């Protein structure tokens, strides 16, 4: 059931901001490995003396990579005179975040109708403020509140390309890479305790709720297009607890990137795993794919089923739809954040968000496949 | 003239160690953009709880990329019990280095006959010690002394693959990339004052000395295969001063990578500039290549000359030989460290090091070409 209890009008995921130590190298690695286009920048060449920010896009997916310059470049600046394009940025916060967690997501940004209203309502319902609403170039309003750990939920609202202060990248430097990724499906956080974390986030958004490892629940917006699952560990080793130990606390676990064609996406990504791209988790045993026809035989032809076997793609099914999924290795040095590629089948109305679930059935289907 | 005044037996450049925030993403970017093979690792999967280190190799060129884990992973370790494979590593030093300078070279490593003797003699002749000699697995000895800024000169000596504690990468994860790079030619540092810096480094090594921008001199070993130029700025804007401001002091400016075939190297690197690799500085004006036949007409055929024009390759000449060179854009966010590709022609005896010089003539040949 959908109570539709959003306390402000939420639309879609807008962007994901990574806080790194060197934004150039991460952006280039991600661009090549994921097939994302280099489309906007904010740095020294655009007059930003505070931070380097490079935007990658694939369809509607927007990845932002930000790193701090030497504070000496902007020592005489104050906040009213800053040359930073993202006003919530903070040298001390960024360096502390990066040295504490390593590479990871700082901001999950969602587009809203009015960021300042979204901030006010959120704080009045228990959200811890992080950056107050600020209007950029009389065009865009941005505000941030705490989500979990050091991750903040960012509200963006437009009066009427990314943000003021960003430059469109020249076509010569912008290679039209595309492996089929089109938008962000969901963003999942790991916390030490799911109870307080759900109560906190559901408390200020009004989002409703959608033997190995974790306990989890999924918070969703009204149209169920903004999906925010959260994991806690179970003790008795949990992948969630390993994340908390290596990340130094709560944070974002994985980003799910919907592909228009997961087969092409995975062929392009796997071709590049060993030449600068991303490695994937080991494939399921062949017993797993020898049981797929037993479950998804009416959805996937056995030509397509065996194509999932070469690519290592997982299949799960739901009340209303079918899910195709695969997980990469951790994106950086630490066994923390990783990426999942998905494509959903069913629930045609547009496609309703969350069609197929999130792969809970794949835990027992893989536990039993390895026998 | 060559005084051959080395105070200990120096052989060759051994490796360059980059200190980064995330060693996975930098290594992968460098691997793809430069065509270097992923050949050794030291991290969690090999029992290293202190730091992640990934070695790239192309011919004899060895690039090492190191980042610190969370100190919590090794809080109970002391130096005699450390699981770090590089014992000179220090969480506080690495994070301070990276947050102060951004991505850059921490260690220029040269192979010597006896690292502990090299350290003792160096310190007794005025070198500031950084890490005392330590014997690894009764096989390799490592020691470090300060070079300039936070860059240390590292001595490696072998009793008889990189270091103890590193694992050979499995062939499945090791793609044989190769764009023609074969060894490190020279490593150049920028300092605020060339006088004290030369006196300091020449003082403890015994190395002998080999209107726009800089003042520089080149220190060399006996066989002149280890070459260490140093730049200072001239005021009246200097690229050297810009480096010092953005790097927060002295450091390594550029690494010169000798290619067996600079034409193929540059074609492979340029093909990849916009898909995760490295950008190059803008090419000289066509007037420059319209004057190349006037100077190098006896060395390069005009088919090869015009091939330098498409690639943007610079040509300089010496008393004894000819130099081919090109410079990349800065490797990271800050306008600091960059890379130069070179191939030397002449001085056949093996080829004697430094054949062709370092491109001093290209300053006036480019100043006059732009007219
Ligand atoms: C990738 C990996 C590495 C080491 C250990 C493990 C358990 C895993 N791992 C997963 O992380 C994983 C995650 C999801 C997933 O996306 C998901 C959750 O199940 C929680 C609810 C929200 C959500 O979206 C589904 C299936 C998974 N499976 C099957 C899996 O094996
Ligand atoms: C690449 C770039 C960017 C912005 C500003 C400038 C001056 C440059 N720049 C160089 O840095 C450069 C460096 C060398 C060089 O390698 C070298 C030196 O001349 C000092 C002695 C040791 C040594 O090896 C040669 C030619 C150069 N030229 C011609 C050039 O234009
Ligand atoms: Co998921
Ligand atoms: Co040089």
Secondary structure of B98-120 in the HEC alphabet? HHHHCCEEEEEEEEECCHHHHHH
Contacts of A268 (CB under 8 A, 6+ apart): A35, A179, A180
Backbone torsions φ then ψ of B182, nearest 5 degrees? -130, -30
Ligand 2 neighbours, Cβ below 6 Å, are B 186, 188, 213, 216, 229, 231, 239, 281, 327, 340, 358-360, 362-363, 366
Per the CB < 8 Å rule, is A32 touching B276?
yes
Nearest to A320 by CA among A341, A284, A358, A346: A346
Do the chains contact at A175 and B275, CB–CB below 8 Å?
Answer: yes
Q: Which residue among A29, A73, A275 places its CB closest to the CB of B25?
A: A29
- Indicate the residue of A43, A95, A100 with minimum beta-carbon distance to B99: A95
Q: Cα of B326 to ligand 4 centre, how many Å?
A: 9
- Residue in chain B lying closest to A26 (CA): B25
Query: Could you give the CA distance from residue A128 to residue A124 in angstroms, rounded to a whole number?
Result: 10
Q: Give the separation between CA A306 and CA A300, rounded to whole angstroms.
A: 10
* Closest ligand 2 atom to B366 CA: 29
Q: Which segments of chain A are extended strands (E)?
A: 10-19, 37-42, 51-58, 61-68, 104-112, 129-136, 140-148, 151-158, 167-168, 181-190, 208-209, 214-220, 227-233, 251-259, 314-317, 321-327, 338-346
Q: Where are the domains of chain B?
A: 1-178, 179-371
Cα A194 to Cα A232: distance, rounded to the nearest angstrom: 5
**A188: which strand partners?**
A254
**Axis-axis angle for helices B194-205, B115-124 (nearest 10):** 130
Binary contact (B20, A22; C-beta < 8 A): yes
CA A38 to centroid of ligand 1, rounded, Å: 29
Residues A160 and A139: their CA atoms lie apart, in Å, by: 7
Binding residues of A: 186, 254, 340
- Please choose, from the candidates B13, B14, B43, B12, the residue with its C-alpha nearest in 3D space to the C-alpha of residue B27: B43
Which residues, 6 or more positions from B93, have their beta carbon under 8 angstroms from its beta carbon?
Answer: none
In angstroms, rounded to a whole number, what is the distance separating the alpha carbons of residues B160 and B154?
19
Task: Establish whether residue A53 lines the binding site of ligand 1, counting it when its CB lies within 6 angstroms of any ligand atom.
Answer: no
C-alpha A302/C-alpha A222 separation (Å) is 37
Any ligand 1 atom below 6 A from CB of A229: yes
Q: Answer positive or negative: Cα dihedral of B167, B173, B176, B180.
A: negative
Chain B positions touching A99 (Cβ under 8 A) are 21, 95, 99
3-state SS class at B93: helix
Q: Single out the residue of B167, B202, B155, B181 nearest to residue B57, CA to CA.
A: B181
> What is the DSSP secondary structure assignment for residue A88, as one 8-state letter?
T
Residue whose CA lies nearest to ligand 1 atom number 10: A327
CB B307 within 8 A of CB B296: no
Q: Is A11 helix (H, G, I), strand (E, B) or coil?
A: strand
Helix axes A91-101, B91-101, angle to 10 degrees: 140
Kindly give, in sequence order, each residue whose CB lies less than 8 Å from that of residue B319, ignoring residues fewer than 6 positions away: none
Domains A1-178 and A179-371 share a fold: yes
CB contact B340 to A (< 8 Å): no
Chain B, window 22-81: residues with a beta carbon less than 8 angstroms from a chain A beta carbon: 22-26, 28-29, 31-33, 38, 43-44, 52, 67, 69-70, 72-73
10 Å CB burial of residue A137 (0-12, 13-18, 19+) is: exposed
Ligand nearest to the CA of A279: 1
> Which residues of B are annotated as part of the binding site?
186, 254, 340
Q: State the distance from the centre of ligand 4 to the C-alpha of B254, rounded, in angstroms.
A: 7
Technique used to solve these coordinates: X-ray
State whether residue B103 sits within 8 Å of chain A by CB: yes
| Torsion on CA atoms A288, A291, A295, A301, rounded to nearest 10 | 90
| Chain A interface includes B307 (CB < 8 A) | no
Are the CB atoms for A222 and A6 separated by under 8 Å? Answer: yes
Ligand 2 mean position, distance from CA A42 (Å): 27
Q: How many CB atoms lie within 10 A of CB A48?
A: 24
Helix (H, G, I), strand (E, B) or coil at A6: coil
- Across the interface, of B52, B67, B275, the residue whose CB is closest to A177 is B275
Q: Is the distance from the beta carbon of residue A231 to the nearest atom of ligand 1 less than 6 Å?
A: yes
| A333: nearest CB among B67, B99, B276 | B67
Resolution (A): 2.4
Helix (H) or strand (E) holding A243: helix A239-247
Report helix, strand and coil shares of chain B as percent, to nearest 5: 30, 35, 40
Does the CB atom of residue A354 touch ligand 1 within 6 A? no
Judged by DSSP in three states, A12 sits in strand
Cα separation, B65 vs B198, in Å, equals: 28
**Chain B neighbors of A174, CB-CB under 8 A:** 274
Compute how many other C-beta atoms are within 10 angstroms of the C-beta atom of residue B82.
15
For residue B331, list chain A residues with Cβ-Cβ distance below 8 A.
24-25
Chain A, nearest residue to B99 by Cα: A95
Q: Does B334 touch chain A (CB under 8 A)?
A: yes
Is B274's CB within 8 Å of A245's CB?
no
CATH class for the domain made up of B1-178 = alpha beta
Local structure of B83: helix, strand or coil: coil
CA–CA dist B229, B231 (Å, integer): 7
CB count in 10 Å sphere of residue A113: 13
B110 near B12, Cβ under 8 Å? yes
3-state DSSP assignment of residue A288: helix
Which residues of B are part of a known binding site for Fe cation? 186, 254, 340
> What are the Cα distances from residue B345, in Å, to A210, B348, B350, B352?
69, 8, 12, 10
Pairing of strands A129-136, A214-220: unpaired
Residue range A179-371, CATH number: 3.10.180.10
In 3D space, the residue among A103, A105, A333 whose CA is nearest the CA of residue B27 turns out to be A333
B20 close contact with A: CB closer than 8 A = yes
Nearest chain A CA: its distance from B226 CA (Å): 29
């Amino acid at each position: 059931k959908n109570p539709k209890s959003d306390k402000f009008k939420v639309k879609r995921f807008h962007h994901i901001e990574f806080w790194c130590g060197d934004a150039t190298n991460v952006a280039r690695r991600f661009s090549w490995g994921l097939g994302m286009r280099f489309s906007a920048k904010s740095d020294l060449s655009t007059g930003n003396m505070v931070h380097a920010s490079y935007l990658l896009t694939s369809g509607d997916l927007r990845f932002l990579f930000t790193a701090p310059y030497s504070p000496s470049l902007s020592a005489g600046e104050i906040k009213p005179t800053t040359t930073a394009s993202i006003p919530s940025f903070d040298h001390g916060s960024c360096r502390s975040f990066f040295s504490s967690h390593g590479l990871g997501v700082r901001a999950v940004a969602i587009e809203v109708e009015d960021a300042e209203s979204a901030f006010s309502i959120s704080v009045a319902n228990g959200a811890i403020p992080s950056s107050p609403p600020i209007v950029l170039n009389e065009a865009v309003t941005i505000a941030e509140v705490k989500l979990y750990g050091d991750v903040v939920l960012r509200y963006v609202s437009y009066k009427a390309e990314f943000l003021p202060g960003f430059e469109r990248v020249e076509d010569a430097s912008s290679f039209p890479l595309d492996y089929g990724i089109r938008r962000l499906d969901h963003a999942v956080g790991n916390v030490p305790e799911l109870g307080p974390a759900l109560t906190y986030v559901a408390g200020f958004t009004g989002f409703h709720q959608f033997e190995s490892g974790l306990n989890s629940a999924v918070l969703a917006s009204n149209d169920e297009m903004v999906l925010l699952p959260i994991n806690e560990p179970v003790h008795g080793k949990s992948q969630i607890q390993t994340y908390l130990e290596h990340n130094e606390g709560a944070g974002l676990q994985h980003l799910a990137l919907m592909s228009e064609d997961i087969f092409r996406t995975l062929r392009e990504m796997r071709k590049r795993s060993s030449i600068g791209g991303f490695d994937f988790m080991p494939s399921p045993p062949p017993t797993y794919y020898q049981n797929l026809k037993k479950r998804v035989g009416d959805v996937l032809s056995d030509d397509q089923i065996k194509e999932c076997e070469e690519l290592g793609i997982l299949v799960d099914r739901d009340d209303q739809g079918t899910l195709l999924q695969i997980f990469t290795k951790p994106l950086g040095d630490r066994p923390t954040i990783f990426i999942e590629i998905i494509q959903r089948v069913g629930c045609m109305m547009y496609q309703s968000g969350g069609c197929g679930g999130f792969g809970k059935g794949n835990f027992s289907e893989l536990f039993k496949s390895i026998e």
